[PDB]
């Protein structure tokens, strides 16, 4: 556990999170929840 430092976090985050596909399931009054292209685009930051 303590062999996981700040550099280990970024390397596993780039393997699993950064610019990857997602899966969504929603239920209820969900007409104001954003759509799939809104969510897929925000898996990366076009600013850094």
């Amino acid at each position: 556990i303590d062999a996981v430092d700040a550099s280990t976090i970024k390397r596993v985050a780039n393997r699993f999170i950064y610019d990857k596909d997602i899966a969504i399931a929603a239920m209820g009054p969900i007409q104001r929840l954003p759509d799939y292209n809104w969510f897929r685009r925000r898996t990366y930051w076009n600013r850094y």
């Binding site: 780039n14 950064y18 610019d19 930051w45 076009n46 600013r47 850094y48």
Partner: protein
């Protein structure tokens, strides 16, 4: 298909390198197309340029 992961491997996980590639790639492409228009032109018109005038130097 292995060039497609390898070209994304190196350059754009970043957003300032990317702006290098679209500005500096706008140049090698603009010179690759200005070169080909300037050689298809002087191949359709042989004997019609200004330096192909037989009496150029001599008016007197």
């Amino acid at each position: 298909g292995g060039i497609f992961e390898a070209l994304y491997k190196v350059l754009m996980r970043r957003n300032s390198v990317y702006v290098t590639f679209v500005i500096a790639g706008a140049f090698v492409g603009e010179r690759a197309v200005d070169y080909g228009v300037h050689k298809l032109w002087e191949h359709n018109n042989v004997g019609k340029r200004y330096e192909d005038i037989s009496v150029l130097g001599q008016r007197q």
